[model samples]
Target: MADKDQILADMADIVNDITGVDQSEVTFEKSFVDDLDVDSLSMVEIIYACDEKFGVEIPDEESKNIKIVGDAVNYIIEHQS
Candidate 1:
């Protein structure tokens, strides 16, 4: 089972891999688009990578609703191992 730190770290990795952003730039206050420079397509990749990483399928609409890093973290905590 993935712990909280692993989930967060994997999320950072996914964000980095998808957007080429440094993980240091990823913070709870950062917005996916305005902060991390992730557009919609990249957001999809983020969702995909996160889903695969944690073995959870986050829906597209729900992904849209995830505007901040903590939103993803909560999703992972709620749905992932």
Candidate 2:
């Protein structure tokens, strides 16, 4: 299992890299849409980035269930590569 803090840090980097959002603003409590202004297409890119970065498959169906940064981190931690 991956460390939660490491997952969070990597996830923040992924979101920042994909959406051009500031790293300081990316936090576990923030929602992608509400906080980062991430659109559907950007979300897809984020998902693909996560998969490639972590070597974990996040299917389309399950991606919807990920609402916040913490959710993604938890998912990756729970299903580490």
Q: lDDT: which candidate is best?
A: 1
Clashing pairs in 2: none
Provide TM-scores for the models: 0.83, 0.81
Model 2: number of backbone collisions: 0
Give the poorly placed runs of model 2, Cα more than 4 Å off.
Answer: none
Give me the runs in candidate 1 sitting further than 4 Å from their true place.
none
Please give, for residues 1-81, the per-residue lDDT of candidate 1 as tens digits: 766556667777888899986677777678878888879888788888877788657798778777777776677767877
- Candidate 1 has its poorest 10 consecutive residues by lDDT at 1-10
Residue 35, candidate 1: C-alpha displacement in angstroms: 0.7
What lDDT would candidate 1 get against the real structure? 0.76
Give the per-residue lDDT of model 2 (tens digit) for 1-81: 457667767777887888877677777777877687677766788878878887756777757777676776677666663
